[PDB]
mmCIF file of N, CA and C in Angstrom:
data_model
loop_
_atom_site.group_PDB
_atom_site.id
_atom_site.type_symbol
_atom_site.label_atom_id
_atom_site.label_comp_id
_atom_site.label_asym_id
_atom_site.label_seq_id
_atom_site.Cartn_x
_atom_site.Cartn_y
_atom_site.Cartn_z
ATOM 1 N N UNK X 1 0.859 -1.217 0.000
ATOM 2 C CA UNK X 1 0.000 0.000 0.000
ATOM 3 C C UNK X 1 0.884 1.253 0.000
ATOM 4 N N UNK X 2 0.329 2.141 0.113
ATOM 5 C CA UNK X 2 1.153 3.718 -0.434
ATOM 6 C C UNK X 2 -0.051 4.398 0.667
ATOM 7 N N UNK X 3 1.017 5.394 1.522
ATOM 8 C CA UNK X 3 0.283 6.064 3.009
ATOM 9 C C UNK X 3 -0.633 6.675 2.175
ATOM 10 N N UNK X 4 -0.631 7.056 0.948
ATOM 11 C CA UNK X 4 -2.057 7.475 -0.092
ATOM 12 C C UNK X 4 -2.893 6.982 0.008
ATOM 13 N N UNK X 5 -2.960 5.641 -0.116
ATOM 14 C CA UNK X 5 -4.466 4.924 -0.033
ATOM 15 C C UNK X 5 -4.967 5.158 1.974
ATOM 16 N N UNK X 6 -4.386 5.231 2.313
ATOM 17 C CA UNK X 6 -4.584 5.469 3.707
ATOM 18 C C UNK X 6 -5.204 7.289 4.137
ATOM 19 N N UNK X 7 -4.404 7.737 3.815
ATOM 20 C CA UNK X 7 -4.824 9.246 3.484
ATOM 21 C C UNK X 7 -6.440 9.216 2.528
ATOM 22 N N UNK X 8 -6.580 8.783 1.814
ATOM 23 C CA UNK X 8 -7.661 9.132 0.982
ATOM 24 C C UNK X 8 -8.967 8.044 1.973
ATOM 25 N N UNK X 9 -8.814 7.405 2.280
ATOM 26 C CA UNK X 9 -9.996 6.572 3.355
ATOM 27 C C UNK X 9 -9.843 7.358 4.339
ATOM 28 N N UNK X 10 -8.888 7.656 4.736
ATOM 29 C CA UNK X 10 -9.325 8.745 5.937
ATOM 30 C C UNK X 10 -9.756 9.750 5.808
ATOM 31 N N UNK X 11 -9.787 10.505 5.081
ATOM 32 C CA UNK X 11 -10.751 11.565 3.937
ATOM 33 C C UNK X 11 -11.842 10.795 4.408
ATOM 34 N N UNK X 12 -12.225 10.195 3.732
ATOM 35 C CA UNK X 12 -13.650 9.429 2.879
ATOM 36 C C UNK X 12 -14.187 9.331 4.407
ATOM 37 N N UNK X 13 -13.145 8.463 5.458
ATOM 38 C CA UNK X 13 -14.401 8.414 6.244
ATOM 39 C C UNK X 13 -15.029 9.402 6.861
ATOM 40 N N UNK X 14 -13.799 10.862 6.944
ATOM 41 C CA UNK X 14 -14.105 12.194 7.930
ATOM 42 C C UNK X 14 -15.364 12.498 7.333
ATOM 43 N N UNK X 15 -15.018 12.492 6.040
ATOM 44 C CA UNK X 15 -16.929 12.956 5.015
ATOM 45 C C UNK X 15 -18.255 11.984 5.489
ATOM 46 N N UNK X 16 -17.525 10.384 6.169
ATOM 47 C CA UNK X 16 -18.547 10.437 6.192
ATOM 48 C C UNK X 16 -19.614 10.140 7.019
ATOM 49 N N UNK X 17 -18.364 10.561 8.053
ATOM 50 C CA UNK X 17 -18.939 10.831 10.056
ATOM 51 C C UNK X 17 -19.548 12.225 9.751
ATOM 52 N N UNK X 18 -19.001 12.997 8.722
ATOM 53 C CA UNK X 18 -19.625 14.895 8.851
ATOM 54 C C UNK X 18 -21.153 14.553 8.446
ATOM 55 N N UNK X 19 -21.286 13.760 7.395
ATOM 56 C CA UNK X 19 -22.580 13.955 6.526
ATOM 57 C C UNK X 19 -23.337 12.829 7.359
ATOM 58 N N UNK X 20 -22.499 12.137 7.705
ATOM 59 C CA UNK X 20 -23.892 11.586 8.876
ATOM 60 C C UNK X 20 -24.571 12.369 10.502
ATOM 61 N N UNK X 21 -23.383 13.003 10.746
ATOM 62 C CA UNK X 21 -23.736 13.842 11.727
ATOM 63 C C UNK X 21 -25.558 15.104 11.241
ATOM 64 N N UNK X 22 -24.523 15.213 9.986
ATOM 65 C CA UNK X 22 -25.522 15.804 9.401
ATOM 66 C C UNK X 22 -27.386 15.115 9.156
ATOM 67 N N UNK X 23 -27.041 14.162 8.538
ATOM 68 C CA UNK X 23 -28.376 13.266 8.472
ATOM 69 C C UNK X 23 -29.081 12.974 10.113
ATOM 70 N N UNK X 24 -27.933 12.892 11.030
ATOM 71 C CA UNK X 24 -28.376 12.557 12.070
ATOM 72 C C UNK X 24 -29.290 13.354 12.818
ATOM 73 N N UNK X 25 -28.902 14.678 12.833
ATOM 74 C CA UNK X 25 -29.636 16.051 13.466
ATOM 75 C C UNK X 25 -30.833 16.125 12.502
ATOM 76 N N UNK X 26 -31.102 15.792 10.808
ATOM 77 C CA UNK X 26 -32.251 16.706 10.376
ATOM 78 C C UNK X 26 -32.978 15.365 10.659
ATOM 79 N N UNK X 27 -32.715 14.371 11.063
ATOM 80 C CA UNK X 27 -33.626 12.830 11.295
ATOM 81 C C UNK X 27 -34.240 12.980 12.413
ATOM 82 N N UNK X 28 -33.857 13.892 13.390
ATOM 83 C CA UNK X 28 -34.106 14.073 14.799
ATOM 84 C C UNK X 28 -35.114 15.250 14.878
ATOM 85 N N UNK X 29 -34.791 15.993 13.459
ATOM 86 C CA UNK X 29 -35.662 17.491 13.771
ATOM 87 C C UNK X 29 -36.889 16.928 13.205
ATOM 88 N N UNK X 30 -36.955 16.678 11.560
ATOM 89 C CA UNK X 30 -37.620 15.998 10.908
ATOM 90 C C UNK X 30 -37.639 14.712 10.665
ATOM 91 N N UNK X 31 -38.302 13.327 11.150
ATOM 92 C CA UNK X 31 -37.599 12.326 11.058
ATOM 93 C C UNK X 31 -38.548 12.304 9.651
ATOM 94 N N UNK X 32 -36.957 11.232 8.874
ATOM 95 C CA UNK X 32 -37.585 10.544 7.385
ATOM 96 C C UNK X 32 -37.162 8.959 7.690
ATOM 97 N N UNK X 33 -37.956 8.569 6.950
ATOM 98 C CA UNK X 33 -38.067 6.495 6.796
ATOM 99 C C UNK X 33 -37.068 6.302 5.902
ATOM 100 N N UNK X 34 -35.454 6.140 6.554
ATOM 101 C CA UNK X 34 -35.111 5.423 4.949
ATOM 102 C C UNK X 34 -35.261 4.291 5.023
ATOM 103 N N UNK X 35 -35.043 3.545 4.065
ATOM 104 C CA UNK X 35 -35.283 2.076 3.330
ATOM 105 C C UNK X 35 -34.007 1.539 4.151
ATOM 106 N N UNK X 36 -34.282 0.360 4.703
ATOM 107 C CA UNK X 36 -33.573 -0.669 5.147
ATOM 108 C C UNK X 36 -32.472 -1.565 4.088
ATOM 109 N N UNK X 37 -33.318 -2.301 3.127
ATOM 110 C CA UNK X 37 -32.018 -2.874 2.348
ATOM 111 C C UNK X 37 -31.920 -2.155 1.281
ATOM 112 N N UNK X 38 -32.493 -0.911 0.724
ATOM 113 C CA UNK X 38 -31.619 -0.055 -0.347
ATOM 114 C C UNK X 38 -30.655 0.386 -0.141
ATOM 115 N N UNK X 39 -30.980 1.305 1.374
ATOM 116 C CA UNK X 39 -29.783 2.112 1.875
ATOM 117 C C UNK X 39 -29.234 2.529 3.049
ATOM 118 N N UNK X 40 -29.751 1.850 4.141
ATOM 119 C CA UNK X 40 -29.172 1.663 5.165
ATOM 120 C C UNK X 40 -28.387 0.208 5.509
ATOM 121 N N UNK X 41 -28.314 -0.692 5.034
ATOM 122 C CA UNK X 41 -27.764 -2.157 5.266
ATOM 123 C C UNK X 41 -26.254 -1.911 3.732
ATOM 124 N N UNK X 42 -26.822 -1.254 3.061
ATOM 125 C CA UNK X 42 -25.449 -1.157 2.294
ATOM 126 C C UNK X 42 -24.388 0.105 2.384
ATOM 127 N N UNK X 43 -25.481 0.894 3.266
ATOM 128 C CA UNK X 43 -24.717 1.804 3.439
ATOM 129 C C UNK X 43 -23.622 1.290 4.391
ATOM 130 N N UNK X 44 -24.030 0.496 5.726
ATOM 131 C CA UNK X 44 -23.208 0.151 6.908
ATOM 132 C C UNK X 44 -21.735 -1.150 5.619
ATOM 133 N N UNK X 45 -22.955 -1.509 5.198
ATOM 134 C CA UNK X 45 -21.709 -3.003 4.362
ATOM 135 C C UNK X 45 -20.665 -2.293 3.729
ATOM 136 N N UNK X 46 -21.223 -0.918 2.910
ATOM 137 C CA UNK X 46 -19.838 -0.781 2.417
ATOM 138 C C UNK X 46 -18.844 1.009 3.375
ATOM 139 N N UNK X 47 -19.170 0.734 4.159
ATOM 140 C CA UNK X 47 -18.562 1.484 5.610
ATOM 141 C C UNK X 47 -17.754 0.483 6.486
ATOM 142 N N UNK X 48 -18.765 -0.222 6.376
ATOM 143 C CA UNK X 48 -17.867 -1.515 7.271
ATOM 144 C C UNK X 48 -16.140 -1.958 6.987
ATOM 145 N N UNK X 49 -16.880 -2.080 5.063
ATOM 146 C CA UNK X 49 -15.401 -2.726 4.495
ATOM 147 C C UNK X 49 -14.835 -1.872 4.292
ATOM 148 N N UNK X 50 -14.735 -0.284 4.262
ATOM 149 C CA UNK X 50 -14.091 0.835 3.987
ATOM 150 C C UNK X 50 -13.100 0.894 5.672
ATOM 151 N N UNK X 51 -14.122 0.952 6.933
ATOM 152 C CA UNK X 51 -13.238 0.958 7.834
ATOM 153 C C UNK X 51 -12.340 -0.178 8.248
ATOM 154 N N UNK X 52 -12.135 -1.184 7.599
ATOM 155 C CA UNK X 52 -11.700 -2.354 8.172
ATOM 156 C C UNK X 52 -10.188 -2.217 6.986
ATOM 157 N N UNK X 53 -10.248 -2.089 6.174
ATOM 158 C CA UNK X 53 -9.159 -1.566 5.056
ATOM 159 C C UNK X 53 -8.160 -0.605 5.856
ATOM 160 N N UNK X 54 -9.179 0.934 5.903
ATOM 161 C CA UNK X 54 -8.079 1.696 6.494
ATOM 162 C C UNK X 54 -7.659 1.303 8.216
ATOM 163 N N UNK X 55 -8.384 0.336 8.983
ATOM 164 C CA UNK X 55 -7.788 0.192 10.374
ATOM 165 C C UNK X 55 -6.352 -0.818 10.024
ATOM 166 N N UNK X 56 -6.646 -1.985 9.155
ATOM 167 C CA UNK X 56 -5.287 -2.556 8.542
ATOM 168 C C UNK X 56 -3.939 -1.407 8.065
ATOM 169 N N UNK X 57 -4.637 -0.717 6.964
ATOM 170 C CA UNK X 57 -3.400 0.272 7.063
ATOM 171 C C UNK X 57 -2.640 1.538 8.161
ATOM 172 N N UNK X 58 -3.904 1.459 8.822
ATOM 173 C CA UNK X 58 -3.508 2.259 10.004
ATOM 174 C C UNK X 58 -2.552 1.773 10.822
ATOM 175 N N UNK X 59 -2.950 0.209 11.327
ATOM 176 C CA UNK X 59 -2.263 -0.324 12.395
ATOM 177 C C UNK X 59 -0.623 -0.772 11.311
ATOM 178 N N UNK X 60 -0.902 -0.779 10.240
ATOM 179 C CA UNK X 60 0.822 -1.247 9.358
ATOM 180 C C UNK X 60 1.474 -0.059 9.241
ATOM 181 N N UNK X 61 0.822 1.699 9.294
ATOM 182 C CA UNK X 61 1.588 2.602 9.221
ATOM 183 C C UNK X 61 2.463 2.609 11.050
ATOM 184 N N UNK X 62 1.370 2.424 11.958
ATOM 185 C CA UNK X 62 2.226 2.055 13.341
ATOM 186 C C UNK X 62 3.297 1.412 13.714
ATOM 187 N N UNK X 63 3.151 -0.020 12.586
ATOM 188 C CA UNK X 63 4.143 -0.748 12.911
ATOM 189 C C UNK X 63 5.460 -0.639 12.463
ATOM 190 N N UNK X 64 5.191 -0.343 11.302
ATOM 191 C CA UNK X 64 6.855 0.116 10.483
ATOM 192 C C UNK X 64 7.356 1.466 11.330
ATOM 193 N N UNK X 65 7.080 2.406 11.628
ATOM 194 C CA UNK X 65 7.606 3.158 12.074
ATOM 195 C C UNK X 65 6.752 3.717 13.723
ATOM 196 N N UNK X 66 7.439 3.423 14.548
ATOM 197 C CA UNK X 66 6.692 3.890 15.768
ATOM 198 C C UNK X 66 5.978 5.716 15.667
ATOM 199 N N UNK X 67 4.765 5.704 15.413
ATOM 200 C CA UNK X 67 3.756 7.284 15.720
ATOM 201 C C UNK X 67 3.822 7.743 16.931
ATOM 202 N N UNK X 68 4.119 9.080 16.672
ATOM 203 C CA UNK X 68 4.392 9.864 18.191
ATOM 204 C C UNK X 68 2.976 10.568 18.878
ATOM 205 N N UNK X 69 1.771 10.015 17.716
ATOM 206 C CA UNK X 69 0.401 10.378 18.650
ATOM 207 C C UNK X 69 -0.669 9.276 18.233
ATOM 208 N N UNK X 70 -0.529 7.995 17.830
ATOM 209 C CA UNK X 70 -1.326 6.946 17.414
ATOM 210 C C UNK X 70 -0.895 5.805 17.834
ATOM 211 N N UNK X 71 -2.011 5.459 18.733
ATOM 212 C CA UNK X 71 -1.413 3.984 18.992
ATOM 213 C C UNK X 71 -2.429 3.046 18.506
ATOM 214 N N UNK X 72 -2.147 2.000 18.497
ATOM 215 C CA UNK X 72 -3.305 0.335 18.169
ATOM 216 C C UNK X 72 -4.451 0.186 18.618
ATOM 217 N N UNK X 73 -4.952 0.370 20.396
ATOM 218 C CA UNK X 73 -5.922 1.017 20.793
ATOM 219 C C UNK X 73 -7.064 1.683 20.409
ATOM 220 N N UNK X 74 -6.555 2.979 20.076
ATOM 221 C CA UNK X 74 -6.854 4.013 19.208
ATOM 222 C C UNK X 74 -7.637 3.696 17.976
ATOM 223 N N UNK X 75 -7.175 2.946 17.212
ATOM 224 C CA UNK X 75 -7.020 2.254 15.834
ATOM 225 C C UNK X 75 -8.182 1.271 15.716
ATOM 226 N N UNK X 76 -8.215 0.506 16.759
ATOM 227 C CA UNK X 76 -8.757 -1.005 16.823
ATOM 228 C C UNK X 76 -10.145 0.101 17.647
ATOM 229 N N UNK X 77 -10.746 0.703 18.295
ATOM 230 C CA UNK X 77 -11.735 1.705 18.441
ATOM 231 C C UNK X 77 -12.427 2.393 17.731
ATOM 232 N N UNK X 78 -11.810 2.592 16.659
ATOM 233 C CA UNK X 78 -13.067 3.241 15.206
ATOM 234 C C UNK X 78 -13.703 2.470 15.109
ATOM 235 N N UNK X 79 -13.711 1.132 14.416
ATOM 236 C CA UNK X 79 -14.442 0.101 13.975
ATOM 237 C C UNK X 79 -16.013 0.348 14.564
ATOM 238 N N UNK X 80 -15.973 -0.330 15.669
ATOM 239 C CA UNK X 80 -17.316 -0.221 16.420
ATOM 240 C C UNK X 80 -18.263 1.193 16.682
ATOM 241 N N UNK X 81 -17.547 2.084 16.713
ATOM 242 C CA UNK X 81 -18.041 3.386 17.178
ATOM 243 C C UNK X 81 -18.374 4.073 15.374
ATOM 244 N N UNK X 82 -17.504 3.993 14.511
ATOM 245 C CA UNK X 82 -17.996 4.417 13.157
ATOM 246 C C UNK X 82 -19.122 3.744 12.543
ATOM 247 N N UNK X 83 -19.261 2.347 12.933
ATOM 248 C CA UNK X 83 -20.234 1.382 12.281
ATOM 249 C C UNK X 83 -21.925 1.999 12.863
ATOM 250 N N UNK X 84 -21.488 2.154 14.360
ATOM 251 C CA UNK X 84 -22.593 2.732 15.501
ATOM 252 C C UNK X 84 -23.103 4.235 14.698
ATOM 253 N N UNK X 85 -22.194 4.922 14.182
ATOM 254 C CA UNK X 85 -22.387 6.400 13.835
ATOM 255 C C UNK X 85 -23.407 6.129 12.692
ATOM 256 N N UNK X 86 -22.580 5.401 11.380
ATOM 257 C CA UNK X 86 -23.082 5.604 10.432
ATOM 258 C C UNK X 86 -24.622 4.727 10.876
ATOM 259 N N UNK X 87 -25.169 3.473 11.149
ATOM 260 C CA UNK X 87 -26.303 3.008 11.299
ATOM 261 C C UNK X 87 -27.461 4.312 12.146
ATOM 262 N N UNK X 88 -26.808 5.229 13.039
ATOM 263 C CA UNK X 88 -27.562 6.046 13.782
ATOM 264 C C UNK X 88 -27.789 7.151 12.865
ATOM 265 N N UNK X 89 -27.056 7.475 11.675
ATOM 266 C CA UNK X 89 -27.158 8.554 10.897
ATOM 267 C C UNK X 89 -28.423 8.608 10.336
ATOM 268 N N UNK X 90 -29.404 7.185 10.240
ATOM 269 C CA UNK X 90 -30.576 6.866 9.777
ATOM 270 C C UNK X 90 -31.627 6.716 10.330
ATOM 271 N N UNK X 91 -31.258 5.756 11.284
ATOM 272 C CA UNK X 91 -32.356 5.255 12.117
ATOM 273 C C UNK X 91 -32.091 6.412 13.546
ATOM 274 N N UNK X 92 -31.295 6.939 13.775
ATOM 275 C CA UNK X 92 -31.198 7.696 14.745
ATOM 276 C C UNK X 92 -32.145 7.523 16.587
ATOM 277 N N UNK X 93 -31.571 6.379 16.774
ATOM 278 C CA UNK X 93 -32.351 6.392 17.970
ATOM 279 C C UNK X 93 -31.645 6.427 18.929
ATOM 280 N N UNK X 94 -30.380 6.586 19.101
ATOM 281 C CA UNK X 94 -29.425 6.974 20.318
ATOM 282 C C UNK X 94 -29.396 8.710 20.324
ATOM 283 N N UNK X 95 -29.301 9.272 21.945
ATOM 284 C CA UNK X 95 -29.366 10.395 22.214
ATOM 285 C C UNK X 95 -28.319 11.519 21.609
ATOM 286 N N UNK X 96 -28.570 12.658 21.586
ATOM 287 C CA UNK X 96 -27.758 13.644 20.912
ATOM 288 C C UNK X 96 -26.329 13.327 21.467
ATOM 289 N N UNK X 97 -26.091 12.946 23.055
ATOM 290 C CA UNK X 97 -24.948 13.322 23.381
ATOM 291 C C UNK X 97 -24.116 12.120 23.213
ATOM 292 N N UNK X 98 -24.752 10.904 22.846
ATOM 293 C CA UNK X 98 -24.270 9.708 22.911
ATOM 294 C C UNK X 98 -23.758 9.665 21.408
ATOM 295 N N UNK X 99 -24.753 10.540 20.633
ATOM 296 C CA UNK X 99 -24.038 9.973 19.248
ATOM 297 C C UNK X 99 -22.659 11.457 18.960
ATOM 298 N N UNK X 100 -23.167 12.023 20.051
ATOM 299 C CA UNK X 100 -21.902 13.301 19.820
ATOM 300 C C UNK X 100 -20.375 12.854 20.400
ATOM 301 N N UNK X 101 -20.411 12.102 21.089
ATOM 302 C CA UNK X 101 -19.940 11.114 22.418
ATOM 303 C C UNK X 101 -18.493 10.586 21.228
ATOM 304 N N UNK X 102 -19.595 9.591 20.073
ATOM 305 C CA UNK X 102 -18.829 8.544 19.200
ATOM 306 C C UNK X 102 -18.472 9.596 17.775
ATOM 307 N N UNK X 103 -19.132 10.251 17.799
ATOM 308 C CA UNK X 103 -18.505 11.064 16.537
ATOM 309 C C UNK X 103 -17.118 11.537 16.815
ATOM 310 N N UNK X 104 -16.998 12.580 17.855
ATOM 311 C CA UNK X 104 -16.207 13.269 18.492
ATOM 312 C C UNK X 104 -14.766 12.239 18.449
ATOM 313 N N UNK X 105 -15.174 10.888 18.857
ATOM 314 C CA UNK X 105 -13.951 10.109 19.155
ATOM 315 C C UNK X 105 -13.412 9.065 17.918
ATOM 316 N N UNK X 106 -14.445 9.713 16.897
ATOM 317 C CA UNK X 106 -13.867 9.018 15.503
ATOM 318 C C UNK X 106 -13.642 9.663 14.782
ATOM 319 N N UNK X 107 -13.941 11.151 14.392
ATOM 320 C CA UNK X 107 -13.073 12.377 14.111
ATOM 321 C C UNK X 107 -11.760 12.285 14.453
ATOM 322 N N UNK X 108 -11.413 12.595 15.942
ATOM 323 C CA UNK X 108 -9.893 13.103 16.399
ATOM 324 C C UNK X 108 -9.333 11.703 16.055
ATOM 325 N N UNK X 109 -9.513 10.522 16.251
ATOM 326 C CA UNK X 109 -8.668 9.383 15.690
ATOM 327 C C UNK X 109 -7.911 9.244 13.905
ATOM 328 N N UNK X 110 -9.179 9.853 13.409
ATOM 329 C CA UNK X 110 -8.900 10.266 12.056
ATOM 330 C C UNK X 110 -7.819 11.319 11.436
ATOM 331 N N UNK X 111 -8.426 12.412 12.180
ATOM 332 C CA UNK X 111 -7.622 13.709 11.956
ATOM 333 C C UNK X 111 -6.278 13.008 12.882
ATOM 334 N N UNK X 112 -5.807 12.674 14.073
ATOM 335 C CA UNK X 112 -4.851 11.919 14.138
ATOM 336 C C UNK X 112 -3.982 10.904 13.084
ATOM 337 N N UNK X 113 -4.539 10.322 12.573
ATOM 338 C CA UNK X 113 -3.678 9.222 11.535
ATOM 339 C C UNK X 113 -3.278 10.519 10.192
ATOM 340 N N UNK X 114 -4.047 11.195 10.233
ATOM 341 C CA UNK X 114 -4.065 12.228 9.241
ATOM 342 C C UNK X 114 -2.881 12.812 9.182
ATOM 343 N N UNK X 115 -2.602 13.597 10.514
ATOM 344 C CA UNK X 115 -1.830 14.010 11.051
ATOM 345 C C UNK X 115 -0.267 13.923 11.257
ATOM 346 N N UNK X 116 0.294 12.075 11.404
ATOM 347 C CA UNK X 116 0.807 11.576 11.563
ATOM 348 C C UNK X 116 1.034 11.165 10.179
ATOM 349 N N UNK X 117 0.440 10.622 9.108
ATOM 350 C CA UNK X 117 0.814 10.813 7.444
ATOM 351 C C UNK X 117 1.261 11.836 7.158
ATOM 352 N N UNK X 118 0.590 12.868 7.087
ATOM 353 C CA UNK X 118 1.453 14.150 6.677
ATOM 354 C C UNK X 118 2.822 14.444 7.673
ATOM 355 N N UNK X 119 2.816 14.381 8.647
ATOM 356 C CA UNK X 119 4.150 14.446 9.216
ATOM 357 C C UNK X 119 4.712 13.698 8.543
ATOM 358 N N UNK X 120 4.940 12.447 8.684
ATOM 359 C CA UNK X 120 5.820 11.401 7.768
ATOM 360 C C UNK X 120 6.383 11.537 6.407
ATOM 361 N N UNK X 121 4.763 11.791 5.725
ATOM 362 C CA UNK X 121 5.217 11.940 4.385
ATOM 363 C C UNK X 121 6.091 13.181 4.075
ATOM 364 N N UNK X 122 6.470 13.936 5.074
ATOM 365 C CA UNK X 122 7.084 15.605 4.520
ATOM 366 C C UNK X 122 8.418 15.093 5.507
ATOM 367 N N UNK X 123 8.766 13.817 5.696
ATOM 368 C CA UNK X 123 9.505 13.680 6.121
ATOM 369 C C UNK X 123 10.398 14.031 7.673
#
């Protein structure tokens, strides 16, 4: 892999904890019905396999070179809490502060690995 493909999923996912945050609040103001297997069951399937890609490259950018703000922990903690985000972005039935709770802590993990690529890559 190339810290590129790692960089660009970590993109992808920041967009797509923002735009669920987003869906999450107008679901709460206005709730809408989405569809279960159009677009909520594929939405999580292909989130799922998007975060499970970049936690592999995450935890192989750790290992080759020890990160001075990312550890494995850290890493191995998106999984569950992004999967939780994006399914609540729809169905939204966990509380404002609970889903602010898991956003919050899958953002800074992100912008962390982020962080730690661009350091690297600029040498």
């Amino acid at each position: 892999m190339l810290s590129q493909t790692l960089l660009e999923m970590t993109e992808q996912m920041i967009e797509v904890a923002e735009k669920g945050a987003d869906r999450y609040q107008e679901g709460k103001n206005s709730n809408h019905s989405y569809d279960f297997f159009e677009t909520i069951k594929p939405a999580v399937e292909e989130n799922d396999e998007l975060a499970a890609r970049w936690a592999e490259g995450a935890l192989e950018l750790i290992k080759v070179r020890r990160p001075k703000y990312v550890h494995k922990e850290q890493i191995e903690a998106v999984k569950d809490n992004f999967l939780e985000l994006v399914l609540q972005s729809y169905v939204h039935h966990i509380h404002k502060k609970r889903f602010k709770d898991i956003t919050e802590s899958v953002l800074y993990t992100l912008h962390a690995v982020k962080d730690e690529i661009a350091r690297e890559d600029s040498r």
